[PDB]
Structures are given as C-alpha cells and as structure tokens.
Amino acid sequence: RPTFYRQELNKTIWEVPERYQNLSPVGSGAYGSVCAAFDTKTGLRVAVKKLSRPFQSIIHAKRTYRELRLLKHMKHENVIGLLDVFTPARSLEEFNDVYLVTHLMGADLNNIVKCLTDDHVQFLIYQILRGLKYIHSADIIHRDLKPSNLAVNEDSELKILDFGLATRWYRAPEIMLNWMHYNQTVDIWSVGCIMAELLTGRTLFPGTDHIDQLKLILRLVGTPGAELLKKISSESARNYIQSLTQMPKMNFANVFIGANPLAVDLLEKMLVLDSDKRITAAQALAHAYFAQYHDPDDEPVADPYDQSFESRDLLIDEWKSLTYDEVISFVPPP
C-alpha cells in the first residue's frame, strides 16, 4: 500500500497516493469530480476522476461496478482505458470512495467544431470508427456518442470516452421512438451526425425536443418505406411513424454541396433509416473515403467481455464488494 495524502479541492476532499502531484480541477457534474495531475511514476500527465457517491443506491452501485468493468477492459489507442484505480480504504468495511486514473487529454471535439477541411475530417472520423470497431467487437454499444465525449490531443489523436453506461441531436431515430431492441448501429448513426457537423460547421439535426428531433430526421432520409414498416413490432410507433406526412429521401449530394463526394457517399451509408442496412464500423473502415489511413492489420478487435452481470439484481453490499474485488485485482498496463 502506498502513502496517501489529503487536500481540499473546491467542495470535495481528495485522498490520492503520493505519486500524483499538483492536482488541479478540470470540470465536474453528477459523474464525479475530475482533476488534472502529474504522475511521478510514469512522467505522464493524467486525469483523475473521483466518483460522486459511488454506492448511494442499487443503481449507483451497479453504475460504478459497470464503469470500473468497462474501463478495465478497454485497451486500444482510440478508446480511454484505465492507468490506475485506487481507494484510500484498506478493508472492504471502510470502502466508500473510488478513484479512476486515465491519460489526460482536455480538448473535446466540440472545442474544435467552433474552429475542418476534408483530410482533417478523414483522420478524425477514421479514428472514431477504428475505436467503434474495437468496442462493437466486444459486444458493447456506446449509446451516447457525441462531440463532447470525443477527446482530442493537440496532434489530433482522438479517444472515445463515457462508453456503455448511457445530446438528443446525435441519437438515432429508433431511440427517439423508444425501440427496446436497438443494435450497435445507433453508434454509427451518431458518427454520421458528428462527420456531417464537422464538414459543414452546422448541427445536422438541432431538434428542440424529441418530436422535433424526429421531424428533422425524416426530412433528410425520408419517411419509412414498406420494407421497414413491416419490421416495426410496436403498435404505437407503427402508428406514430405512419401518421406523419410522407417525406421523400433527399439527395445527399445536394444537401452536402461541394463536400468531398466520397464523404457524401459514406454519410448516405451511415444515415440509412433502417438500422439493418446502415454500414458497420468494420465495413466503414474499408470505405473509399479512408483510402489514406485504412490498414486491415492495424484495426484490432477486443477480447470477449463478460456482460452477464447486466442481468443480475444484486444487493447494494454485493455490487460494492464486486467493485472492491475489481479495484484489488487491477494489473497496471506495461
């Protein structure tokens, strides 16, 4: 056990081992607090997230467990992964705080949209796909892909954060409609919204609520055709969709006027209404538009990921304790 030490950071008390010096705040919400820090052990500058109220309820105890499990598993250069996880507690008894350490990045991909040429787009969307491809392959849906959770370095290396746990502007139509069985291509939808915005400077679907959000989607990709109408289970949804004014599928080359044609082509493939026909992350990597970056032996997939716990209803002391085992078994990466 290393030697810890204490300090007050704004509202919160922080108790981090001595290897992290010069804590400084960076942002905080109901995620927890994040500080910037120096890691003496590795020379790296890191982000340290102190979780807010890790075990208030059954749903926070599960959230905490899930998030430790996700971070422990992600090892890929376009996806955040865990440098360290630690607590001040020295037994299960006194365990009430969990800290996660990851590579610092602070800028997010919005902090760029308000500053975006063609090759900059290519490199940025190719990286997101290369990380979705890894993510999807362990059988995980990000579910909330959006500019603010895509972090970029000063040399424009990109990493996905906040995966698996979950702004309406980037959600697929099927989620707006509440479909309970959506597949991984909801993430590819959002990628489609994000590349649009980068090439043009504008939000593609700045819906002002969820009905609006959908009006604006169907305006570009058209109302459902019969092949798709026939796969909708839900009475009420079928009825919703089918009761709007019929809208034709727009020509993307008009709407994206003078974008690279290759880029317009990819969009047209990401933004298919029918989620069964949307391109996949692995197939999009092979698309013409990443001609300059695509390499099939440098686009790895993930180890299997045991998500069997998502269907367990456990006590608050049980997730707490499963988390604890996970903090303990943590083997730092090389």
Binding site for ATP: which residues? 26-34, 49
Counting contacts by CB under 6 A, is residue 141 touching ligand 3NE? Answer: no
Question: Is 265 one of the catalytic residues?
Answer: no
List the one residue out of 235, 229, 27, 46 whose CA is nearest residue 148.
27
Counting contacts by CB under 6 A, is residue 38 touching ligand 3NE? Answer: no
Contact 150, 302 (CB under 8 A): no
> In whole angstroms, how close is the CB of 200 to ligand 3NE at the nearest point?
23
Binding mask 206-225 for ligand 3NE (x = CB under 6 A): ------------------x-
Tell which one of 84, 174, 197, 268 touches ligand 3NE (CB under 6 A): 174
- How many CB atoms are closer than 10 A to CB 299? 20
Q: At a CB cut-off of 8 Å and minimum separation 6, what does 311 contact?
A: none
Which stretches does DSSP call E strand in 88-241? Answer: 99-103, 150-152, 158-160
Counting contacts by CB under 6 A, is residue 173 touching ligand 3NE? Answer: yes
List the one residue out of 315, 314, 287 whose CA is nearest residue 129.
287
Tell which one of 234, 239, 242, 251 touches ligand 3NE (CB under 6 A): 234
List the one residue out of 200, 197, 188 whose CA is nearest residue 273.
188
Q: Report the binding-site residues.
A: 26-34, 49
| Listed ranges 1-9, 66-74, 158-166, 273-281: which one lies at the site for ligand 3NE (CB under 6 A) | 273-281
Residue 132 CB-density burial (10 A; 0-12 exposed, 13-18 middle, 19+ buried): buried
**Marked catalytic residue, from 84, 97, 162, 187:** 162
Tell which one of 231, 312, 328, 332 touches ligand 3NE (CB under 6 A): 231
Half-sphere exposure of 305 (CA within 13 A, CB side): 22
| Listed ranges 71-79, 136-144, 177-185, 319-327: which one lies at the site for ligand 3NE (CB under 6 A) | 177-185
Show which residues are catalytic: 162
* Residue ranges binding ligand 3NE (CB under 6 A): 173-174, 177-179, 224, 228, 231-234, 237, 241, 273-275
